[PDB]
């Protein structure tokens, strides 16, 4: 795989070894982000941010320092807008944060809001740089509240992404085998993709250990929400010294994950095609991906479909290997569909989402050939 797509051999679409510290110039930004649970609980967060100074982003050289600052500013922004998470919101992002945020967001071709590539792909570190990438050897860089289970939610999401990312290096073999007409090579490549997607489901099971439902629903769910289609910020958020009027940006979501949209595109599931509402939502989230990953999803679409190759040829061994990749995705979205009921549907009852997810699950399951 070419380098300008920013695909790592080990962590896939995740940022390889994200740096943890900013330069001393931005030490004031760092203090608010590193002590978010304490400043919010104390009720001194919103005025600590208001007393900040205007810091120019010109001293944030290279990619990793910009991705960390975007993670820092994104977390601060979520804490300022939502506050303690009880309904008292702020509709104006002060200039001392709003100006360099959009200014830096323009340099990375990302919207000025905390996205999936921030709080998951760049929000981690190896506790021991010598040991493998296990949950016991990692930790998040920033969290919102005490006991919000953000470390479990983010690290498990990262580990599912890394597990599913080991099948990305197989994608070049799939397209080379098609143009060379190598049935045996294409056969083995598809089986390898399904094997990596089945390991991703096994990693998904870790989430029951590190995330409890009530903490996710009543705490962490608040700070991961955006201001697009949100009644609490009806017309969006004001970015002060950058925009003349409000702006509506969607909150973080795994619809912004390039891995799950890669294999939907590779397998011809065409989750973007259809013109429906769920198809438009996933095409929208592509704008929330880093530009190199946005370009990678688009390059796969320029190739002949893997689905039309297997479909035309009467090869039962090729159809079962293709369906093994499709079935692995259905197994993910089905177990994920149980996850939503445990941490959203059940906690909400004790106090459109469902319709969107099983619309994606239905489109995937209707892409099978044998069943
Ligand atoms: C931790 C590993 C997780 C992974 C790998 C994951 C994966 C995904 C993906 C790929 C999507 C886009 C739709 C589709 O392609 O399926 C999605 C959307 C969604 N997920 Fe997750 N998810 C995870 C955790 C969770 C948890 C813990 C919850 C609730 C407790 C949840 C609730 C939702 C909802 C309500 C949507 C659709 C609404 C929207 O995306 O804003 N997910 N997830
Ligand atoms: C639950 C949540 C509050 C957050 N969501 C989310 C966020 C992230 C992320 F970026 F933070 F890492 C990853 C992820 C995977 N699956 C769902 N994810 C989407 C759905 C959500 N957002 C909303 O607006 N309603 C909702 O239920």
From Swiss-Prot:
It is an enzyme of class 1 (oxidoreductase). Induction: By IFNG/IFN-gamma in most cells. Exogenous inflammatory stimuli induce the expression of IDO1 in antigen-presenting cells such as dendritic cells, macrophages and B-cells. It holds the Pfam family IDO. Pathway: Amino-acid degradation; L-tryptophan degradation via kynurenine pathway; L-kynurenine from L-tryptophan: step 1/2. GO terms for cellular component: cytoplasm; cytosol; smooth muscle contractile fiber; stereocilium bundle. Its cofactor is heme b. Binds 1 heme group per subunit. In the active form, the heme iron is in its ferrous state Fe(+2). The catalytic cycle does not alter the oxidation state of the heme, but IDO1 is prone to autoxidation. Expressed in mature dendritic cells located in lymphoid organs (including lymph nodes, spleen, tonsils, Peyers's patches, the gut lamina propria, and the thymic medulla), in some epithelial cells of the female genital tract, as well as in endothelial cells of term placenta and in lung parenchyma. Weakly or not expressed in most normal tissues, but mostly inducible in most tissues. Expressed in more than 50% of tumors, either by tumoral, stromal, or endothelial cells (expression in tumor is associated with a worse clinical outcome). Not overexpressed in tumor-draining lymph nodes. Its main location: cytoplasm. It catalyses: D-tryptophan + O2 = N-formyl-D-kynurenine; L-tryptophan + O2 = N-formyl-L-kynurenine. Catalyzes the first and rate limiting step of the catabolism of the essential amino acid tryptophan along the kynurenine pathway. Involved in the peripheral immune tolerance, contributing to maintain homeostasis by preventing autoimmunity or immunopathology that would result from uncontrolled and overreacting immune responses. Tryptophan shortage inhibits T lymphocytes division and accumulation of tryptophan catabolites induces T-cell apoptosis and differentiation of regulatory T-cells. Acts as a suppressor of anti-tumor immunity. This is Indoleamine 2,3-dioxygenase 1. It comes from Homo sapiens (Human).
């Amino acid at each position: 795989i070419s380098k300008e797509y920013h695909i790592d051999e080990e962590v896939g679409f995740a940022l390889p070894n994200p740096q943890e510290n900013l330069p001393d110039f931005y030490n004031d930004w760092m203090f608010i982000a590193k002590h978010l649970p304490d400043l919010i609980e104390s009720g001194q967060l919103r005025e600590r941010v208001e007393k900040l100074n205007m810091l120019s982003i010109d001293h944030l050289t290279d990619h990793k320092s910009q991705r960390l600052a975007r993670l820092v500013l994104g977390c601060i922004t979520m804490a300022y807008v939502w506050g303690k998470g009880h309904g008292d919101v702020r509709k104006v992002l002060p200039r001392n944060i709003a100006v360099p945020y959009c200014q830096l967001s323009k340099k990375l071709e990302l919207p000025p809001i905390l996205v999936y590539a921030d709080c998951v792909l760049a929000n981690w570190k190896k506790k021991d740089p010598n040991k493998p990438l296990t949950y016991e050897n990692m930790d998040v860089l920033f969290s919102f509240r005490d006991g919000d289970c953000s470390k479990g939610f983010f690290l498990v999401s990262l580990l599912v992404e890394i597990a599913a990312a080991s099948a990305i290096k197989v994608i070049p073999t799939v397209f080379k085998a098609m143009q060379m007409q190598e049935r045996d090579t294409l056969l083995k490549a598809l089986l390898e993709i399904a094997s990596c997607l089945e390991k991703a489901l096994q990693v998904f099971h870790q989430i029951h250990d590190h995330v409890n439902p009530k903490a996710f629903f009543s705490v962490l769910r608040i700070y991961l929400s955006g201001w697009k289609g949100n009644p609490q910020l009806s017309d969006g958020l004001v970015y002060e010294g950058f925009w003349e009027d409000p702006k509506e940006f969607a909150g973080g979501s795994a619809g912004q994950s390039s891995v799950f949209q890669c294999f939907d595109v590779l397998l011809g599931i065409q989750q973007t095609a259809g013109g429906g509402h769920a198809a438009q939502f996933l095409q929208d989230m592509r704008r929330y991906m880093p530009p190199a990953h946005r370009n990678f999803l688009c390059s796969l679409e320029s190739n002949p479909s893997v689905r039309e190759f297997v479909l035309s040829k009467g090869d039962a061994g090729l159809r079962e290997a293709y369906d093994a990749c499709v079935k692995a995705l259905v197994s993910l979205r089905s177990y994920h569909l149980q996850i939503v009921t445990k941490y959203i549907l059940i906690p909400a009852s004790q106090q459109d989402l469902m319709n969107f997810l099983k619309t994606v699950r239905s489109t995937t399951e209707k892409s099978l050939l044998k069943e």
